[PDB]
Design a protein around this ligand. Structure first.
Ligand SMILES: Fc1ccc(I)cc1
Length: 162
């Protein structure tokens, strides 16, 4: 169990442009293409990301390559963020995966705003952090995925994914 397997479970794999839970054009293992309603705009982003004319379709190798880039970008965004880095550095490796998962789904800026949850996590008040994390649009809109991530923060185990 590692961040790649965890996010692969949470995001699935689709080789043609699809819409995420918010209605936004996406491809692969949860790679957001654009928030624009234009499918042509999404296709342009895809071609730029892959480096060829894709027609809205990629290979599994390409999906996995984008996925590695996206996971790394989430980690780098954490490490460059003055609010997120101290919390991340305080966590064990399993809980660090839960943190990356949140940043992958919502972005550095959104997670950096989870100020009270982050403090509880840094204080290792796991049950209180889990309660606080669920008081969110995130939990209400994607409750099964948020429950898995929250259980990972609460327990420091992979139990929710097993
Ligand atoms: F550094 C961190 C980034 C995101 C979370 I959620 C927790 C720690």
């Amino acid at each position: 169990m590692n961040i790649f397997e965890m996010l692969r479970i949470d995001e699935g794999l689709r080789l043609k442009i699809y819409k995420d839970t918010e209605g936004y054009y996406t491809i692969g293992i949860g790679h957001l293409l654009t928030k624009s309603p234009s499918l042509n705009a999404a296709k342009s982003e895809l071609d730029k990301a892959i480096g060829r004319n894709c027609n809205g379709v990629i290979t599994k190798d390409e999906a996995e390559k984008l996925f590695n880039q996206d996971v790394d970008a989430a980690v780098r965004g954490i490490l460059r963020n003055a609010k997120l880095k101290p919390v991340y550095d305080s966590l064990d490796a399993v809980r660090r995966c839960a943190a990356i998962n949140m940043v992958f789904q919502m972005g550095e800026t959104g997670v950096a705003g989870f100020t009270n949850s982050l403090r509880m996590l840094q204080q290792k008040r796991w049950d209180e952090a889990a309660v606080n994390l669920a008081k969110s649009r995130w939990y209400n809109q994607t409750p099964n995925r948020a429950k898995r991530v929250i259980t990972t923060f609460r327990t420091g185990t992979w139990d929710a994914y097993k």
